[PDB]
Design a protein around this ligand. Structure first.
Ligand SMILES: Nc1ncnc2c1ncn2[C@@H]1O[C@H](COP(=O)(O)OP(=O)(O)OP(=O)(O)O)[C@@H](O)[C@H]1O
Ligand SMILES: Nc1ncnc2c1ncn2[C@@H]1O[C@H](COP(=O)(O)OP(=O)(O)OP(=O)(O)O)[C@@H](O)[C@H]1O
Ligand SMILES: [Ca+2]
Ligand SMILES: [Ca+2]
Lengths: 360, 361
């Protein structure tokens, strides 16, 4: 049955429609020496002898030879399947240019000979996975954050906002502020540590200025992190300062609005009629929305921006790290969907532009 | 505020109006007549029946003559609605299972002949379900020329599960004409056909239990009703009242092989995956003039209930405004703020030719 490939700036997720989870998740990295290319964990573990390139920049593909290598690796290496035997559902960023969507289609039929394929907007899948066709998706990943208003299955272009602030940026920041504390993480292995601390110990303060005040006057918020070798390194206010940068992006030297303001602006950019539904259906997705306390904080921040009237509801599924993928698995495994596949016949008739009839 | 145009093409009648309105402004017979000014459409063509050759360009929901359909749309814009079509977006409707080739042509005509700034094509059934406030359910749409059963799920018609029944209003009027002749009335003239139709629309009803009602008709006159003609001549009608629309359930009455409307609906539901049937059974929506019979909803309820698994919650929704529910759906859909995203622009037409319509969604 169908393949589901969720291309990401940091990681790709691949598996089979109908499964609870992707069977493979690997770094979106292509390495070349001076075999003539390696992808993923294999490339990383040969870092010292390969030139590394990241083909997906901020959700958008910028190098097509490398992206084809990732897909080749996905099929013949990770999933160990013949692509000419399975329908393939691929995902795309919001506001992906038509030119890109056509190239994806071209590669699938012409290089991989897929019998059928489809391209869905990642955000629409996340909303789908939550059992909705209307709402606003806040998707924060490794490379980008998007706020994507959706109404009855239709993502609204005029109202989509992009924020080039995500996971990398947060890991980068935690690295910087731990250095402050007297720790040093210059190597690439030491970066894996920082990222681990970020994913295990960080959290969003409800009230940031009080949280600062508590930390300055109490140790009740400090937690210790144990390294492989047994070395324990203590983390204090950097636990909540790091993710705070999502709400106060000046922390990273950036001249952009927080995630909360950006969400509000996206809603505000819609016709006054559907806002009630967007406000009451704000859905969080992506690894960078995984911090404890984030949903409470969003609730409070949006509440503060929105008219008093509005019921505000933030939905933060526990499955949200993979909600894009799980959406793809749900969509591609419905019999009611098998109608929506774009076949080799239609492509050899209409060519790469037929893909724009994606209703997802 | 510039309102979009909503044109519901139909086998018997076309309905036209402006998005936002409760109702189409114009409803007129889908007829193009030509003599042997060189063409007339609608009521104007009928009233000159004697000197024109009338043709029906929409046979069973599907356009079969493009020259004539073009005339119908010209008449709609410039004659019935009195608008320049290049000032307004146009939403047109199409039958279920409309071939790709016909969609292309519709699109071509709109941009190339009528210079519309934007257009959109919706499946009639999907609009009926939409007008009822739903995105999931099954629509039983019975009109003048055709009956379709159309399962829809989350805004999407399931074409594999769509069933077509070439039995509708025309067939029922023809039948009532036959059985009224049985009793000793003559309705030969086309004028007189208007009478039979009128009787069909005013006095007919669906019996809940047919055989029972036959016996009621046989044993007292309590079911007889009299119809008065313009000239004052009264004609009485008894069992023909319910026998006529019964043909929808028992098509053998018309000499036809086909299953009834209730079987057809059931089969359509059965053709769908089991994990959605619960929803289809609970959301069965009736649309089209031929579903206007009193008693029809009760009868469907009982008939489907008899066919369906016993555990199943059956619900037949028969809106009062169901004669125009297709149109009302179009007017709802086009009056939406997010409609603009959904349509095809003039810009996209210069770009991707008339095939743009398989590339829309
Ligand atoms: N428990 C966690 N808490 C905080 N952040 C996390 C957690 N787990 C993963 N992340 C972060 O989420 C990011 C990856 O998430 P995701 O897979 O949604 O993004 P992506 O799809 O690779 O990239 P993008 O969507 O930006 O193109 C990484 O930066 C990672 O550090
Ligand atoms: N009140 C009524 N009771 C019974 N039948 C009616 C009533 N009103 C209209 N009809 C019948 O319905 C038919 C017209 O239906 P409608 O306009 O919904 O469909 P259409 O678009 O003309 O046909 P098609 O579905 O084939 O495209 C005519 O045969 C008409 O006599
Ligand atoms: Ca992603
Ligand atoms: Ca109709």
């Amino acid at each position: 049955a169908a393949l589901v490939v969720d291309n990401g700036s940091g990681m790709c997720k691949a598996g089979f429609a109908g499964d609870d989870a992707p069977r493979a998740v690997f770094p979106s990295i292509v390495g070349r020496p001076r075999k003539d290319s390696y992808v993923g964990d294999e490339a990383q573990s040969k870092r010292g002898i390969l030139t590394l390139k990241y083909p997906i920049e901020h959700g958008i593909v910028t190098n097509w030879d490398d992206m084809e290598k990732i897909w080749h690796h996905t099929f013949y290496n990770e999933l160990r399947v013949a692509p000419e035997e399975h329908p393939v559902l691929l995902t795309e960023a919001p506001l992906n240019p038509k030119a890109n969507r056509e190239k994806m289609t071209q590669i699938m039929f012409e290089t991989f000979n897929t019998p059928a394929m489809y391209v869905a907007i990642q955000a629409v899948l996340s909303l789908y996975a939550s059992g909705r066709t209307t709402g606003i998706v806040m998707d924060s990943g490794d490379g980008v954050t998007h706020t994507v208003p959706i109404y009855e299955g239709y993502a609204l272009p005029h109202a989509i906002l992009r924020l080039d602030l995500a996971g990398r940026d947060l890991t980068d920041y935690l690295m910087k502020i731990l250095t402050e504390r007297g720790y040093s993480f210059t190597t690439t292995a030491e970066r894996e540590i920082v990222r681990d601390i970020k994913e295990k110990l960080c959290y969003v303060a409800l009230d940031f200025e009080q949280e600062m005040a508590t930390a300055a006057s109490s140790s009740s918020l400090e937690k210790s992190y144990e390294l492989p070798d047994g070395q324990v390194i203590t983390i204090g206010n950097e636990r909540f300062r790091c993710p705070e940068a999502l709400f106060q992006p000046s922390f990273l030297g950036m001249e952009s609005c927080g995630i909360h303001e950006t969400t509000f602006n996206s809603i505000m950019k819609c016709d006054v009629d559907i806002r009630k539904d967007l406000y009451a259906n704000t859905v969080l997705s992506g690894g960078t929305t995984m911090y404890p306390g984030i949903a409470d904080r969003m609730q409070k921040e949006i509440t503060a921006l929105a008219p008093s009237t509005m019921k505000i509801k933030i939905i933060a599924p526990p499955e949200r790290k993979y909600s894009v993928w799980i959406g793809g698995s749900i969509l591609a495994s419905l019999s009611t969907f098998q109608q929506m596949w774009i076949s080799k016949q239609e492509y050899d008739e209409s060519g790469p532009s037929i893909v724009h009839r994606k209703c997802f």
